[PDB]
């Protein structure tokens, strides 16, 4: 009927890996004939995609890029700090975002940044932010961090249960508490929207409170 047959979907890295776990089994029971192919792709790939017709739908963080195209938030995403052990913050439960002024913060070119990087800074205007490892990825990111290169910013989802993990310390970040809108992205005038409407509206109740 309304939710069989494949579908497209498209995921940015900082979130397909993290994400797909917690919603796969529950789309797989809420609609049993329908066959999803996941994809991972930088945001401008994804976008280029699913205005060719490549893709039925992109899941990703809401940018500048993707109003020109049918938004609907599934859910807002904080982020952890993630610092080496023999940090000198490794003993503070939490860190304001203005100490990470004159700290050196790693990065990526794409799907990490809080602000539009029109502005020209990632995370923090006074921080020392590297792009040696722009073009590489989240895990790359987490393991230099391991090795004492820098620190940085990691989305929730991507943090694993405990505070303390193979030489990674994580801790919440305040005033304010750095949070990113993760939403499902499609072609305006889509002659499938309607499908595009149920499959947001399942993953938004899934999602639901899991950050409380």
């Known amino acids: 009927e309304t939710m069989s047959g494949p579908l497209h979907i498209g995921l940015i890295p900082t979130v397909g890996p993290y994400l797909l776990p917690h919603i796969i089994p529950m789309l797989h029971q809420t609609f049993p004939k329908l066959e999803m192919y996941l994809h991972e792709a930088q945001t401008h790939q994804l976008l280029a995609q699913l205005d060719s017709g490549k893709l039925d739908a992109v899941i990703l963080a809401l940018v500048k890029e993707s109003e020109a195209f049918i938004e609907v938030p599934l859910f807002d995403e904080p982020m952890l700090l993630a610092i080496y052990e023999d940090h000198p913050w490794?003993?503070?439960?939490?860190?304001?975002?203005?100490?990470?002024?004159?700290?050196?913060?790693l990065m990526l070119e794409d799907g990490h940044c809080l602000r539009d990087q029109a502005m020209g800074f990632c995370f923090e205007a006074g921080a020392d932010e590297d792009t040696h490892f722009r073009a590489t990825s989240l895990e790359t990111?987490?393991?230099m961090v391991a090795a004492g290169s820098g620190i940085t910013l990691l989305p929730?989802?991507?943090v694993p249960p405990e505070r303390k993990r193979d030489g990674v310390?994580?801790?919440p970040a305040i005033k304010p508490e750095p949070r990113r809108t993760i939403g499902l992205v499609y072609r305006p005038g889509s002659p499938l929207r309607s499908r595009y409407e149920q499959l947001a509206e399942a993953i938004r109740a899934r999602m639901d409170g899991h950050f409380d």
């Open 141 to 143: 990111l987490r393991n």
């Open 90 to 105: 490794a003993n503070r439960e939490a860190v304001p975002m203005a100490d990470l002024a004159g700290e050196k913060l």
């Open 156 to 158: 929730a989802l991507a």
């Open 169 to 171: 310390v994580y801790l």
